[model samples]
Target: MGPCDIYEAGDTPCVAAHSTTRALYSSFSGALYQLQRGSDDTTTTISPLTAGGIADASAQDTFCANTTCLITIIYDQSGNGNHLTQAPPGGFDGPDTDGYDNLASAIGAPVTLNGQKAYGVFMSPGTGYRNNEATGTATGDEAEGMYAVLDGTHYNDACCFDYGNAETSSTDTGAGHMEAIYLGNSTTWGYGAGDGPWIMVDMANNLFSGADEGYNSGDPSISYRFVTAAVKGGADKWAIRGANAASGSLSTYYSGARPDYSGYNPMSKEGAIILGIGGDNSNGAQGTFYEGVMTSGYPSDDTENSVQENIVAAKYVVGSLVSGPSFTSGEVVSLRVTTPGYTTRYIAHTDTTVNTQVVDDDSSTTLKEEASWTVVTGLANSQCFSFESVDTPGSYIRHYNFELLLNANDGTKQFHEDATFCPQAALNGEGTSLRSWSYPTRYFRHYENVLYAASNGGVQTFDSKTSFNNDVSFEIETAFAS
Candidate 1:
């Protein structure tokens, strides 16, 4: 049985079910979503393999091949006719002119569901989905529950990567006007147990960690490859549940009274459903979504537990649908930039003491060897990374007083820290960006061919915006030596 079937068995039927990968109900048979292609301004509707079946992603592959495409609408399988479309401009942020926000890039996030290849919703800073005039959604102190599949690792400290209830007005109606599952590390408003990437509740004014508390130590830091985020709200109480989407039963992170704060007791929820942004369109966030649904009433733990089991049974796996690198240690790969002619540029070292250069791609065996690097577990931190030159096995790329270069591993603490770097989402929106572990504010950047662990300014640079994205972003490609 599907998640909706379990919810209905508990007397809480789904009000809206949205997904890009599979049908949320056992008996669902219809269009899952519609996308528009950039190649010819044409459109295509993706359908399920059968009623309550997997998405036919090959249809999208055929139509969107050789061009770009964006998800236009996520059909609601609950028969609510509450299909989610691109969100409109709002108070905090607006990337569009008059109406909708940016549509999600169809190929930006691909995954396997139930061992079948499919495309999940990849939401960048500006992407969002909404259904303001949604039907069957509970409003004002009503009890409701929801669950969304997520890539637990792809998130930011941006305002929100919210999914659930929001205001129809596309504005914050006050505290409690919204009730959505907020995923991110924005400590500016609130935080959780540890250095977050926590799952909290967005109830308009603040993101609650647990009930009325600001920091819910109970909220676990979820860093799994895939996660299941679930939440529920009744008149005076609420709950937060999470699980590893790959395997596991649900765990209740928080389950108790609503926030003691004013405007929260009776709840001011407006019934509309939203994804990828907050009620006010505080759109600076990045995340991944597979499938989600909203139930008309609070779901019992038994129902949610069974639903999670069913989800695990479906099998969500990381596959070729993804477009970037995984950065596993000891793996040999080429770090290439994506800026036009720079796309051919790979990280390389001249001789043994000079600075690294953005070497051009070539067939010459010597140049190809210089362009390859073996990814190493971070010299200082296991969680981060360091790159060891393939040409010089014992040497790694290190920052010498901020300028990046190759140096032999002397096995010193300073050398280890200097060699370590952490990966972040590309500042330019193309590939991965590496930030220095020692100089957290600086990133490995290319300037006039030479690479440096550089900051935003110096005689070396001027604007904080220009060239920053291009200089720092590097795509992890197949090893030149391979």
Candidate 2:
């Protein structure tokens, strides 16, 4: 049913399963990754919508609204506790300040999985994720199968953009000390067909594209937007396989004896997980990683094929990971929020002649009437929408001086644009974010109990990213019986 489920069915249990877009196991419900906000240094985990479902990226949208965020941990769903964190300094590279590799931005590598918005690890140079002191990974001469979904176009000929087994010491302990999937256009160590961006087996020193340590025409360039690259090794046997992650089956680039090179006869894998760099933290290459896994033993070709099918079924598209509520032309709704202390709040204004600050919740009919809004197509553009006050009929909610207020349509372009908002993926995972159509980056938010259309990094005091997600996010609910 899933990657690990299939592998377990084939008697090759998964040692680690990593993904930020979807669950690798059919019933995985835990957090897929840890997101750390730059605002308050607080961290929260993002999980799937349901077991076996895609990621709840709306969570990231909410928590990471104002300030930038980064991926702190990619939790190992296999229960191995082999979770990846920022890579520590390795032998090939000097110890970075604090002795750690750079982190991937949370919203970098925007993508869609099954049409829902998600993000991947957009590994720039010096960016990586790893767990050197890992558990449940293969070591010594043990066999293992590893695969990662990558952005085929976003790669370089640098040292490596690798994932899978690596050394615990993060050193170039010579050949056979590491075995990971290498995907890039590097010609320094090995070669492949075309102006290759091939799936090469990075077995320590050699980036073996084929049997010999030199060039192999069998392995061809895979320049698809998204690709599934894989590698497996055991004893004196190893293989490299890959396919377009968007569709079709895998093409085995190489599957036979290990490279005819010294020390590769019996792999001395160190049983650690690494991404975006070699075992020695050769953090020069750049790549985008969607998901990957390492199995305890070699997986059958059929098993890999099934995994490919699942990958394709996920529909990996290089698109925005934004999702939100779909509205009917005249549906009535309320933007309610569960603020601190379990207090409920809705968007409603007390003054209409002037831009009155929108405020809180009380179950009074007066307040409920003020809170309700009529969803209508945008006056400025049909692609978006405008919210009309349900109580005043023709009066609509619009922004004035960055504050949200109720105003009767004056038939002006400024009013049309100010009143219009484009629905976006919810920042809080509960409702939708109505980004101001005029301001572009600014969205409707409640700050300190007042309503305003605020930008994440805007100079406005209300734009503080702290709780920006929760403050701006309002649950769309059925209107009160006013």
Candidate 3:
């Protein structure tokens, strides 16, 4: 099997495919988490599931939520060990102090990108600009920049920074440099001498161009998506690809040679690989930065395309909802509910008398067996789903007198509303959640021994109140084939 890094909610025996370097999976309880696609496929947490930001003082280290510092550090999952991080406050002691300090305090906090937690670094014209220079080297035949979604309001000659690895001076040969950038409305680059080999995706112009070649608008960005790729090698040679919100595959917009003069210069590698800003660090582009990778050798087109496919599969679209692995009619599944609180708990079968309650057991047979329900999908839309009991076939799990219990499907409005649920995937690639079709505001939740379609203490809206706590989150798996 191939590397099984990309996983859905109900992935049995959670594993990764062979040769897979990195993988991200949304847990059954609707929580986004990363995994190292190694022999064991170890689950690794990159960003905190909760809302907050932390920084890594040492540019060489990986900063996590538990880190005492308070800054955003870009973690690398490529296994190449080429992580991009910003400079912390007060600067470092020696060579680490490169002047690329944190961005404005107001904008350096972590924010959600495409519904997933991401590092938010702002680069204002004069004051807000911030760029991190690489301390080590990561030169290879191919370099790839994979971004989930990037957005900005202002438009300058430079729109946003993707990734750049260049020589210290203008005369660097053999030591070739490459940068994948998002150009604003400007026609020319603000840094170089108006001539140099570079690969860029002009989001504003809907064109992908280089120094020698003209603009190619075949693949445009009508809106941001989870997949974007830029590859460059020697002079006058490069390729660019992008995918939109609904794109299942990447479309090549540009591929060919660069301008004749757009080759490498002979110089020493001085400046470190920079992120969120240009090589000079002056033409700072402001926007969100997700994940990126670089290789010493240029990657093959097939390799790059496979990476894009992995990105599209792993990404969790913002507003789309679908069954976790395609639910079929008559498929039996168990819905495990989790709460959002200090004590994480799951909705479980309290007793065999059609009564359910929230419990702390993750491997309880009662919880798994009693919660099993048969899929009933003969509804108006794909969102409408009715779940019947696996044990008591005629008895369906519905809200009765504000309590959730097994009841007969009498085909009444209340019964329909109570039994019919809208299963939607969480925005951050977490598992899926259920909302009552009639009472959309109220989610299916369990408080201790009482299961009900109720709010999480506050308004019934699906904001932070109904957030993907273990209480409201769920994992559905096919118990039996259709």
Candidate 4:
């Protein structure tokens, strides 16, 4: 019932591959994939993104780096009238443009264009917007070409060039997933005249066929193949099969699933259904799934509407390994690192220099003026160490600074041979005082618990009922304090 809590299948039917698997796939209508680490007890998890759904950025981050990424977006327009208000040509609301009036006023920004609203896709770099101006010329701002919009009828809705009246409520707020194919090209967005990589599937009609071959990790079925091909680490290529068609189109076999508003209330309104990966996104306007394509690897999947399907709507990356610190005044240190995900591979930094002394628990022992130490293991991820001051005879002391790398599995790391000056500040405490009691020697009582004295002198005395007039006296003055 709670967010991120574990559930048992109870013979109901489920799959198990790793013990660390936490959240279950409530939306089993879609196939699930996972990546597990062999050394530590860690596992990478993923799920479909839906309208009103929230995600843990940490998990999705690993999935993005090590594996291929794909996202699925659904759009519906039945209940809401399918008529896209065709804004009169000229100025803000031109032909084929999907315009919402009043978004600026809702967010407390000045109403630049009367009450005209702004429209944008999830995960967009900023908001791709278009509206009327006093000059009668629509001022389109920000990096514009990253989003693709489909009207209720499923036709390509060009930005501003294609204008219309579609009002999405300012009060209606929620989270959803967007999927796009990753194209290696650095230029062009959506389907352009040149070779700009673009997504070409209609999401609303696609179904997630179970694992290829029902479980043969290798022989993924058409559904699984579509996802794997789209998201595979290199050479972006994929297809989302329509219900019965071989490509993006509505299918007779398609049946909608209930919204899974599992954990957080993104919409803030109760009973406001959360649409799944392939559900409609046209302000209740019905439409089929349309393909979204990504350009390049790093900056292309810049918006939520871009990669919502293959992975969750969150950004994660472990920092490459960083050198702890150098003892020399100006010596250079080297760092290295790597991230998870099959389709996404990382290039190691053979030489990232840090011109400072290395200080940490391991460096506590001062080396001769010419001696140097090298940390060969656990260099990436959260492992961090630093040198507060130059390593002088008695003027310097080693210190550690922990860090969280972008592409690592765990958020925190522990180092070997660590000690703390402040007992309370220690992460894991040590030592033992087997038994202790509360009472002075003059008015002592029988030992109800283990006792530890200040000094190493042992003269045991016990008077269960009379230490003074209190009739309870037990005193063992031992020189032991740990």
C-alpha positional error of residue 414 in candidate 1 after TM-score superposition, expressed in Å: 23
Which lDDT tens digits does candidate 3 get at residues 1-482?
11112221112211111101122322111212222211122334344342222121122113321111222333443333334444322211111134433322111223333354343333333222222344333333333222333332222454334444543331222323444455343345322123212235421112235433344334243234233544444333555655542346656655755433322322122334444444444333444333344443344555555555655543434323243333567777755443444233333344324444343335465455565667787232344577676656666767654456777777754466567666645322345656554333345665553566653333223222333244455666444222
- lDDT per prediction? 0.80, 0.80, 0.39, 0.19
**TM accuracy, model 4:** 0.17
Which 10-residue window in model 2 sums to the lowest lDDT?
A: 353-362
Ranking the candidates on TM-score from highest down gives 1, 2, 3, 4
Those runs of model 3 whose alpha carbons end farther than 4 Å from true positions after fitting are 1-70, 78-81, 87-101, 104-149, 152-156, 168-177, 190-208, 211-222, 225-227, 262-271, 318-482
Clashes of each: 1, 4, 35, 84
- Error (Å) of candidate 2 at residue 260 is 1.5
Q: For model 1, give the 10-residue run with minimal summed lDDT.
A: 456-465
Candidate 4: lDDT of 415? 20
Error of 1 at 428 (Å): 23
Q: How far is candidate 2 from the true structure (C-alpha RMSD, Å)?
A: 12.2
Number of colliding residue pairs in model 2: 4
> 342 in model 1: Cα distance from truth in Å?
13
Write model 2 residue lDDT over 12-77, tens digit each, in one string: 888999998889999899999998876778899999999988888889978976445778899988
lDDT string, candidate 4, 266-332, tens digits? 1111111111011122221111212222222212222221223222212111112211121232332
**Which of the two, 1 or 4, has more lDDT?**
1
Taking all chains together, each candidate's TM-score versus the true structure is: 0.72, 0.68, 0.41, 0.17
